[PDB]
């Protein structure tokens, strides 16, 4: 029986990104008018938006995505925090080519602020120009030592430094380059990225750091 079309009731908030990113005004989102029987901030607070790092930086960051999760609300403002980085589908699919070895290593590590992260890396062998084998695999020995190197760096590079510096780090892709330096002594490699980061455990609350990062 005709009733309550719902937008004509809904309220708007402006999604705000952390400081390390560049521009910070992500877009807008709608919730229901708060009623005592309700907390529009409730239906608002653990929401996560996934935005492209390119929109976030402005660029070459076509591939790469960041998951931004709403951590608190202040009048039409909602302050989000790093929740993850993935790659998309197209980019990842495009690296994976036959005749080359695909190498993956991932490590789970606690940051300086508590956060527990599982953080993945990836690489592919490279034929080097005057090669005339068509393929370019690596040996099992190689990959085992390469993986150890990737893993050592990723734990080394996340142990020291908080969620923010990992972020500040993943933007100019300094890990990538570091891997490249530690591995060329062992075997070629084309591509190379920390390709995903997964938030496993969150520390408790603290608006302090959140604001430090926003505001």
């Amino acid at each position: 029986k005709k009733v309550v079309d719902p937008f004509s009731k809904k309220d708007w908030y402006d999604v705000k990104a952390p400081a390390m990113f560049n521009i910070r005004n992500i877009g807008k989102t709608l919730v229901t008018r708060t009623q005592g029987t309700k907390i529009a901030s409730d239906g608002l607070k653990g929401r996560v938006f996934e935005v492209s790092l390119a929109d976030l930086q402005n660029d070459e960051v076509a591939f790469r995505k960041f998951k931004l999760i709403t951590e608190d609300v202040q009048g039409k403002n909602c302050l989000t925090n790093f929740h993850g980085m993935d790659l998309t589908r197209d980019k990842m699919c495009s690296m994976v080519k036959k005749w080359q070895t695909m190498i993956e290593a991932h490590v789970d590590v606690k940051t300086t602020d508590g956060y527990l992260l599982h953080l993945f890396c990836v690489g592919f062998t490279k034929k080097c120009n005057n090669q005339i084998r068509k393929t370019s695999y690596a040996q099992h020995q190689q990959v085992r030592q390469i993986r150890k190197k990737m893993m050592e760096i990723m734990t080394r590079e996340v142990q020291t430094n908080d969620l923010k510096e990992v972020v500040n780090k993943l933007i100019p892709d300094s890990i990538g380059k570091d891997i490249e330096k530690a591995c060329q002594s062992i075997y070629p490699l084309h591509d190379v990225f920390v390709r995903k980061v997964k938030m496993l455990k969150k520390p408790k609350f603290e608006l302090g750091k959140l604001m430090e990062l926003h505001g």
Binding site: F7, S8, K10, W12, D14, V15, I26, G27, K28, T29, L30, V31, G43, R47, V48, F49, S52, D55, T70, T88, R89, D90
Partner: protein, 136 residues
């Protein structure tokens, strides 16, 4: 109706989300969180025949009925996640998925990024109905 804000420049943003399978085509904008909907409508509802559930022309009609209320409630713009049946299912796009995208862009909403989100599985759960294949 309504609008997040006057904005003679940037556009209020939502998520477009199209599932194209064969035998139908879902179009779907939601709030960039996802938790809250906004105007759905499928390629089914706008024709009758079951056989024609999935045809691009129906798909157009659906993306048109959708874009309407999209620009009628507040979304000025939308980022799209196209999908297939996925799972162990086919893994190829259904026919009126393209048609829906051409229909909303043409409609005159705004576009932003794209990824595919069909669920591809580090394979298993045996695919349906048996070893000798659908024979037909």
């Amino acid at each position: 109706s309504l609008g997040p804000q006057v904005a003679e420049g940037e556009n209020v943003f939502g998520v477009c989300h199209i599932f194209a399978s064969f035998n139908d085509t879902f179009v779907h904008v939601t709030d960039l969180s996802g938790k809250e909907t906004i105007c759905r409508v499928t390629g089914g509802m706008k024709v009758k025949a079951d056989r024609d559930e999935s045809s691009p022309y129906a798909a157009m009609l659906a993306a048109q009925d959708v874009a309407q209320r999209c620009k009628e409630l507040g979304i000025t713009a939308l980022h799209i996640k196209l999908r297939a049946t996925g799972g162990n299912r086919t893994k190829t796009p259904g026919p009126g998925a393209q048609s829906a995208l051409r229909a909303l862009a043409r409609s005159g909403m705004k576009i932003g990024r794209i990824e595919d989100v069909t669920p591809i599985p580090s394979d298993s759960t045996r695919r349906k109905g048996g070893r000798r294949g659908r024979r037909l």
